[PDB]
Paper text:
We show that Cad1 binds specifically to and acts as a ring nuclease for the cyclic tetra-adenosine (cA4) in the regulation of the nuclease activity of Csx1, and the ADA domain of Cad1 converts ATP to ITP. Thus, TaqCad1 is a dual functional enzyme mediated by cOAs, both as a ring nuclease in regulating Csx1 and itself, and as a deaminase to accumulate the level of ITP. TaqCad1 assembles from three pairs of monomers (CARF dimer) to form the hexamer with a pseudo-D3 symmetry. The ADA domains create a donut-shaped core, while the CARF domains extend outward in a propeller-like configuration.
To elucidate the extent of structural heterogeneity while achieving best possible resolution, we performed dual-structure reconstructions for each complex. Capitalizing on the inherent pseudo-C3 symmetry of the hexamer, we extracted all dimers by symmetry expansion while tracking their originating hexamers. Subsequent conformation-based classification of the dimers enabled high-resolution refinement, yielding optimized maps that resolve critical features of dimer architecture and ligand binding. TaqCad1 dimer is formed through both the CARF and ADA domains. The Rossmann fold core of the CARF domain (second P-loop and α6, residues 105–120) and the helix-turn-helix insertion (residues 211–229) comprise the CARF dimerization interface. The ADA domain forms helical contacts involving α21- α23 (ADA interface I, Fig. 6A). The CARF interface undergoes a significant increase in the buried surface area, from 1161 Å2 in the apo to 1753 Å2 in the cA4-bound state (~50% gain). In contrast, ADA interface I exhibits an opposite change in buried surface area, decreasing from 1236 to 893 Å2 (~38% loss). Mutation of the equivalent tryptophan in LngCAAD abolished its activity. We designated the apo dimer as the relaxed (R) state and the cA4-bound dimer as the taut (T) state. Superimposition of the apo with the cA4-bound structures revealed large differences in both the CARF and the ADA domains (RMSD 4.1 Å for 453 Cα atoms), consistent with cA4-mediated structural remodeling as previously reported for LngCAAD.
Numbering used by the authors:
A (entry chain D): 1 to 609
B (entry chain B): 1 to 608
Write the structure that this text describes.
Amino acid sequence: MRILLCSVGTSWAVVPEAMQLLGSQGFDEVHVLTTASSKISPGVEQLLRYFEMHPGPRFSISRVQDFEDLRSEQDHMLFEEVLWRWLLQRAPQAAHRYICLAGGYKTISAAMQRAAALFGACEVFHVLCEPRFGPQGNREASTLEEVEQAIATNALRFVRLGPEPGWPQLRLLSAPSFPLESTLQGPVHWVRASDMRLRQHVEGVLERSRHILAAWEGISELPIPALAAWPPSHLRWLHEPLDPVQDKAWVQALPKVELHCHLGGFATHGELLHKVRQEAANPESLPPVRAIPLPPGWPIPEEPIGLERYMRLGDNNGSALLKDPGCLRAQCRLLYEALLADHVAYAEIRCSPANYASASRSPWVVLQEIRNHFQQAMEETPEDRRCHVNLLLTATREEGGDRSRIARHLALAITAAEHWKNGCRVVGVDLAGFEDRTTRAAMFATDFEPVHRVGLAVTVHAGENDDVEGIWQAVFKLSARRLGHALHLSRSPDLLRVVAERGIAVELCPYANLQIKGFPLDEEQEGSETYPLRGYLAAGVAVTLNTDNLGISQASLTDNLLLTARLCPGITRLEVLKTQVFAAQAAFANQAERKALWARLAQVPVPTD
Amino acid sequence: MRILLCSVGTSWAVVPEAMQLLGSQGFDEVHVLTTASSKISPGVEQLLRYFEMHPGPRFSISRVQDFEDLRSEQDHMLFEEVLWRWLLQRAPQAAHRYICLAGGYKTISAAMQRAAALFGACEVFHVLCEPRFGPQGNREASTLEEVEQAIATNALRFVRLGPEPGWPQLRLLSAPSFPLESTLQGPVHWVRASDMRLRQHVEGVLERSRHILAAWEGISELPIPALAAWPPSHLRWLHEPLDPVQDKAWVQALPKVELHCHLGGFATHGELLHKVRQEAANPESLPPVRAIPLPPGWPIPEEPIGLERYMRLGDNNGSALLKDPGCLRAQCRLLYEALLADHVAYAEIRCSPANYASASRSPWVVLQEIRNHFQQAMEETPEDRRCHVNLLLTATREEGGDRSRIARHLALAITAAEHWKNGCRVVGVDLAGFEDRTTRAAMFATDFEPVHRVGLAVTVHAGENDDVEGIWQAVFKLSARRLGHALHLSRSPDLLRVVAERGIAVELCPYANLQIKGFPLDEEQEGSETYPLRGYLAAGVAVTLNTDNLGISQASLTDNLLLTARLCPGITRLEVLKTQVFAAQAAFANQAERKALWARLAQVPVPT
Ligand SMILES: [Zn+2]
Ligand SMILES: [Zn+2]
């Protein structure tokens, strides 16, 4: 809890004097950093003597290797880097520090205070002992018996200066980020600094701190303000192309947003299918496993397979299995686990409760059970590990919008919108079948005004066919906020400009689009038939990268982000961060959900290169 | 200009060594602080004898009157008071302050370094006399010619800890406000403090700051990425409440965005009106100057005057005056100069070209002239200070007026949206009125799809004194992206949430809202009649602050920004930046204009 450092330049007796700041409350964990000269050797020996004569708090002394006396600016920079590394390692928490300024022979105290200013503390103080000590009773206490005479019969006054909270940018730095090499050559720690990397980090943070004109246009336009704390080299690494094989660890560790994830396309083949098939409540009404051979090369097929073949790939799950309550529970828990393993911070799961509704299970029962499964899954999860799952309701069935089904669907959506305000809740409706004319006419003939009034947003499956007019009508007559796919916006620059200026999100799915429609892979220049992601980002379009069916596509979200280097050659890692930012901004999340998601996306993993 | 300040204990060579930070050039002025203990006394005389071979700069040495040792925190507080008063007297500004950190007997060096981070210093350094080749080469070269020899042979290593900006809150303090006595027995001042007044102000400021930073910690909330590179003191100050008086200059220098600015209400009265009139091409056709008495206390009347009186306040300019081509010329030029003087980076000016049309001047002619005047204004000014102007066409009609008027307005907007693609552009339509149901019903009977397709956006004056159902209609059936005024959105939480989540901007006009409507001022605590800015910002609504009519409201956009301090108790400077960023995001700008606006908007001035 409490940590006391009080680095020793000389005069070992300062440290035992400094551990009586709190009194009969203790200093919990105690560490010491010192210059490893011959003079200190008696001092460190006597510090060990005092430590062994008074048990209690953890005791560690760290002498610096190849540093015998601070003698210049460079000998001070070396100790300053070692001080910062030992500080971050021995006191990991940003505000658990009781920094002691006493005991500096040459600028040690100044550097210690400056480190307190730069990294933070909760008490930067100085210790004074009365001069009623020594052989003649005229100096301070510099002996074990003198130290005890000081501790008892109170003679210690403590000048507290302040907590000094420290720089916000430098508080993100930790010991694992900057390893410090230590050798236990005895009971005393022996520390050396390998590279001057903390020093460069801190100085770079402090340069743009005082830079006025040079700082601007060098860190601006950056999608996340936390990236302005990033080193200039880590920012250059962001403006360079994504590596699909080297940046896999980075993308996997990236907090991500999922806005397009159908529930019924998750456990459609393999072990997940047989798990959702074994958690069944009724194991004898369960449909047989239909032989569905995956296309050769899956998830990357040699030729596009089309939409109907893609849909029939997910025929072992969906309405087949999820009408069983046990299968639906297994499906929801396993999909939440798959979202957890992929570092998905926020997710909007598209579900169609009527497709999973049985004779004894009305659509509202199915929807309520799905919501409760996801709510339990999130409630069993720590808040900085949690994925906030929201729910969307889908309007399926190409070729015919029978007015009875949309009315049941939208009414269910409206009832569920007002039933839950916290945790998992229904936040919108997804309008599938938009790629027809009868279902599309039924959608535009349906009144979505109650949906708009209750706070539900609208998404549409877009751009599978080059239908600009359908996009126009969904945007302005349906008040849709997001477009699914929409792979042919670039053909009409006017619709591009409208979508970009109105902030309408485009939900791109790399593997799904590649498998259903087909796109170039590993091309050298852009061309005409290339995936439209780069051209949408250049237009100013809020592009979001999602899956569609985790099972049918046989892919996670991180793999989908990895493919963008193969689908769009030259895509940078900053563009991936921008895509995550667009997905966060476009999510149908309320205030608390949005703040939580933006708090999770500020924790972008640092590049390990 | 530069100043040097050392403290002195037994070691007196610290000051002569520290004066060698600049070689033979030295420092323009130097002062020294010192205690009163008999131990240090010979050092004072030796320091005094050290000069008299360096004519020019004057060297002063101060000694606190009755301090003999710093043996308690009590003495360290009185010494810190004296030290800060002496620092503020002898080192007025922080850009020329060099704070020598050696000669630091007990907690004096820590105090000197702690006084460098609160009040500021251009360099905070520490002097080392290494190597210690004194007599027989065993101790640091101090006392007597042992110091001048060291000056002649280096061995003075200078540990420069860097500079220190200083707390913005603690840099307005001056020496006259906290005087220090100067009892002078010859060359040496025995300075002491009258009362512990300065320390109390410092500790209070630091205490409210530590209460603030706890709930205002991080760099992931800042709307501008360039803000994340600010010093922690400057970031902490950015979260402090905005002061309408001491932040006048900072808000004035801010790059701002204007989204609601009527062209016809700019030179409404005063010298601007006469300057516009004297540029008329036909002085004999100028209407007489009407006697329009402004309400007492203008621009801050004690009671609201209402929308009708506010409109009548601008009868001496606008439709009557701007039918003259020279008058419209001068109107556009002076409005652009007003935008430039206010450091406005992006502006959307609302105009009614048909209101300024004549027999020989069609509305298209008037719109073309307005656009070309603004374009030429943008071309004459350098790009760094260049304000980008876009045009909105105002769809206002008459009680029992014409749908043909609205049709002509929308056709003109569509035609202009295609005529110009660079510089000044007609980027949307402003559906004025929208309060009465006679004109509001005509809006919904009009097809706005041609407006939507050509790329024009829609903004409505809705929410001033009308229903929330009109807000729903504008949002969903008119595809409006911005709402004019809309001060009653918080009454209906569902409509407020829809506005917040859909990203619809709310165009607040603080001065115009205070003048037309009524709102408490400087109430220091929120209530039921308070300005809805705080609740709108908290709910997640994109809130832009605008001027409406510059001439009628008699206030610039800086003044509108600063009036939110008196309308909203506790508005922060970071919230002003958030309003600017909301305006930038809500602008009907294309890629080039948005990029330029963000390039200029990242250039946030630093506090003084
Ligand atoms: Zn889909
Ligand atoms: Zn207006």
